[PDB]
mmCIF file of C-alpha atoms in Angstrom:
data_model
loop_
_atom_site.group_PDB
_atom_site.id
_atom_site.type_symbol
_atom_site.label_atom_id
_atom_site.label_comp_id
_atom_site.label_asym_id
_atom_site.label_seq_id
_atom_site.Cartn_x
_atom_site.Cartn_y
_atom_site.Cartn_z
ATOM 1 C CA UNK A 1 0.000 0.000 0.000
ATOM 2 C CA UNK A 2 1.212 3.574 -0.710
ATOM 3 C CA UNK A 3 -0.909 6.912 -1.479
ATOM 4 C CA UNK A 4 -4.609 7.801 -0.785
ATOM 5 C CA UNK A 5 -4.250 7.108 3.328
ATOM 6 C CA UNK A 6 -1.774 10.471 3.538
ATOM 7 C CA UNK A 7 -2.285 13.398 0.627
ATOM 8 C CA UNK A 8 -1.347 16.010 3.085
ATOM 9 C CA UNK A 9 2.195 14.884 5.118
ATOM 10 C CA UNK A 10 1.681 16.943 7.729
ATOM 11 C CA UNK A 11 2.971 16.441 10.972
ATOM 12 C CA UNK A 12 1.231 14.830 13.834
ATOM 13 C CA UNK A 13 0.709 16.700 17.482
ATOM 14 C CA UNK A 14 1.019 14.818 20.971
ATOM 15 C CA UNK A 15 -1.651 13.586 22.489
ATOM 16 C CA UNK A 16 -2.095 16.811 25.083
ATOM 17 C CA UNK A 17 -5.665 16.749 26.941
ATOM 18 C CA UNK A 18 -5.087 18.285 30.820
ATOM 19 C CA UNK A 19 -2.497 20.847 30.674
ATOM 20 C CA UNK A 20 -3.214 24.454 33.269
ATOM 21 C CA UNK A 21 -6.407 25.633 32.587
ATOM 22 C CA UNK A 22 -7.866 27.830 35.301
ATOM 23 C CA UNK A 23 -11.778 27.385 35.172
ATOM 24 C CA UNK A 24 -12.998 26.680 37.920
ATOM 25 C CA UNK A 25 -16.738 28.951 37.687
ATOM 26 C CA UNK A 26 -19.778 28.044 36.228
ATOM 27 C CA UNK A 27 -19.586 29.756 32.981
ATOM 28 C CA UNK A 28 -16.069 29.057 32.684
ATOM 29 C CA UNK A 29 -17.313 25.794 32.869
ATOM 30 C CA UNK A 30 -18.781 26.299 29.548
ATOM 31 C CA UNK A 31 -15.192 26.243 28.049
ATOM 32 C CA UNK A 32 -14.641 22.902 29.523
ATOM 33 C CA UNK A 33 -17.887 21.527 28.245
ATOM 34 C CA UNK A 34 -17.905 23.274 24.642
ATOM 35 C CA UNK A 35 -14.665 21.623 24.377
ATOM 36 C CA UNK A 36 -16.057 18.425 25.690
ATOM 37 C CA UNK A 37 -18.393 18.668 22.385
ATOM 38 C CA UNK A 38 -15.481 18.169 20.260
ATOM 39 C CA UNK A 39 -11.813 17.942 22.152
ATOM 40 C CA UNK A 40 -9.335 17.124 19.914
ATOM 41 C CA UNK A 41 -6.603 16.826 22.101
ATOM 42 C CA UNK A 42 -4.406 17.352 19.167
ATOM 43 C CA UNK A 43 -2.601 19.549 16.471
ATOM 44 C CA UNK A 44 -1.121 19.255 12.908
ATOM 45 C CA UNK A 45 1.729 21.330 12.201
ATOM 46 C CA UNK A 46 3.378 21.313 8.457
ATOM 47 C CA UNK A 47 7.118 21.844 6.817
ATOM 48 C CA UNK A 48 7.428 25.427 7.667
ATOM 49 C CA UNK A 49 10.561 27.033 5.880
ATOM 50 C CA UNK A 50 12.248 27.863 9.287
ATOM 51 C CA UNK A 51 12.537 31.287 9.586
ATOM 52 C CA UNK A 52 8.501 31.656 10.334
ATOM 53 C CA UNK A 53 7.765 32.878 14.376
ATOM 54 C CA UNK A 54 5.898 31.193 16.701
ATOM 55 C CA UNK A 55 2.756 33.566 15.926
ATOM 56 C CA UNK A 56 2.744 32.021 12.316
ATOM 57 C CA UNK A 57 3.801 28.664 13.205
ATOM 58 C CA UNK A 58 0.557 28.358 15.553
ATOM 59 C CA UNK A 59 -1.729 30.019 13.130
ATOM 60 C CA UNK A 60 -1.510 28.264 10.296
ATOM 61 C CA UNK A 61 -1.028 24.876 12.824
ATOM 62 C CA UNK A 62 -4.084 26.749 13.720
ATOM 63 C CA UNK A 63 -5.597 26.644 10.459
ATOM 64 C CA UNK A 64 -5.118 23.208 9.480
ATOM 65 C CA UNK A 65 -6.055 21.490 12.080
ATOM 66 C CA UNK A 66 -9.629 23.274 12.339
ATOM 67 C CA UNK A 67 -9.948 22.488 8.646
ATOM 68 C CA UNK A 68 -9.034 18.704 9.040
ATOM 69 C CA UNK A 69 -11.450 18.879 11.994
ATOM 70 C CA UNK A 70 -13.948 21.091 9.558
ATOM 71 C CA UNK A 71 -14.574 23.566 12.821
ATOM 72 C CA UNK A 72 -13.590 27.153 13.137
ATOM 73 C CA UNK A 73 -13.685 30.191 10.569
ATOM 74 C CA UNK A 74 -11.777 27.053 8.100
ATOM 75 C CA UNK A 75 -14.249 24.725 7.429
ATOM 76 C CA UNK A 76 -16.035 24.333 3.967
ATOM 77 C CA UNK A 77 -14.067 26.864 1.999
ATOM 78 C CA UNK A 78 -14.656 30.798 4.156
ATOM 79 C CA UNK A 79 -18.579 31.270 3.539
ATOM 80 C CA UNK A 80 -21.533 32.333 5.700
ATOM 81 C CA UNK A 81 -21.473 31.535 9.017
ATOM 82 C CA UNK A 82 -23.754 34.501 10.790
ATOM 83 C CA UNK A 83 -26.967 31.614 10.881
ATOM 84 C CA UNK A 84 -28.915 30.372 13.524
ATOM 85 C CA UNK A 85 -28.956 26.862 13.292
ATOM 86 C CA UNK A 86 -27.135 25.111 16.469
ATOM 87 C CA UNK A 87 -27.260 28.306 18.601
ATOM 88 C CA UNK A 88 -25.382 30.936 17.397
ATOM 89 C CA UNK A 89 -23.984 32.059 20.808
ATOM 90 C CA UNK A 90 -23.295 28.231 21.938
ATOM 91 C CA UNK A 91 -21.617 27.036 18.492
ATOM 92 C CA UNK A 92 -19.705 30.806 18.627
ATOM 93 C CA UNK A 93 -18.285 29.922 22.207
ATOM 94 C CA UNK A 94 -17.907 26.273 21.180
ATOM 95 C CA UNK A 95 -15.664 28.026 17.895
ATOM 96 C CA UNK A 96 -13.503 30.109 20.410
ATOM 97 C CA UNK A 97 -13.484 27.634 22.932
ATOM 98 C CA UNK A 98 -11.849 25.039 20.147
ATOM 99 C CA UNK A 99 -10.011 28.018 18.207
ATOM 100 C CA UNK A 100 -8.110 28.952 21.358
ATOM 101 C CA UNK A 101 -7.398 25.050 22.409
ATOM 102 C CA UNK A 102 -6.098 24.136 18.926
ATOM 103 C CA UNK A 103 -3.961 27.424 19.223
ATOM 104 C CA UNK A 104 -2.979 26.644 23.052
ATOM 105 C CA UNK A 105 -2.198 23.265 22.292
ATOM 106 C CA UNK A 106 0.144 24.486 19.215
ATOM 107 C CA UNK A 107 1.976 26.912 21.730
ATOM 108 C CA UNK A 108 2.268 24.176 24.372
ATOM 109 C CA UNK A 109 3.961 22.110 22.185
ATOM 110 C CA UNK A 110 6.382 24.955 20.836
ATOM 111 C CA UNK A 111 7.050 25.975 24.363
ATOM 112 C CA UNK A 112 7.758 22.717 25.256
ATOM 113 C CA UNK A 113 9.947 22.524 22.150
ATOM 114 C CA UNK A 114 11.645 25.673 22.852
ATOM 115 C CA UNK A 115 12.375 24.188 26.459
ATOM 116 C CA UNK A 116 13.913 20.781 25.173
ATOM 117 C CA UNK A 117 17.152 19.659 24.909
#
């Protein structure tokens, strides 16, 4: 076997579900459980030339791994979004909630990186 399983080559993220994360409150408990909807635990990263920063680096990271998941403002192609359907405010909150873990995740692992010998 060769080709069809692996089109993109990008490269795989830890397993990373637990790190510091403060909330504690009700609402903030909201973040936990919009997460819970989805949690991914995980981020794809791809053959950046080098000299990109971290800011980039976890971006696109970013941006990949939402469209793989097809979540975030990267899903099918860039289109309309402003609908009600799931509950705009819940499926918003679920978006940052998962925007900002994907994007976490990504710096946890460069930090992490950065910190390794």
């Amino acid at each position: 076997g060769s080709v069809v399983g692996g089109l993109g080559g990008y490269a795989m993220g830890r397993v990373m579900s637990g790190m510091n994360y403060h909330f504690d409150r009700p609402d903030e408990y909201r973040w936990w459980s919009e997460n819970s909807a989805r949690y991914p635990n995980r981020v794809y990263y791809r053959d950046y030339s080098s000299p990109v920063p971290q800011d980039v680096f976890v971006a696109d990271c970013f941006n990949i791994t939402v469209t793989e998941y097809s979540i975030g403002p990267a899903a099918k192609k860039n289109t309309s979004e402003a609908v009600a359907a799931a509950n705009q405010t819940e499926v918003e909150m679920e978006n940052k909630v998962v925007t900002k873990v994907i994007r976490e995740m990504c710096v946890q692992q460069y930090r992490e990186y950065r910190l390794a010998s």
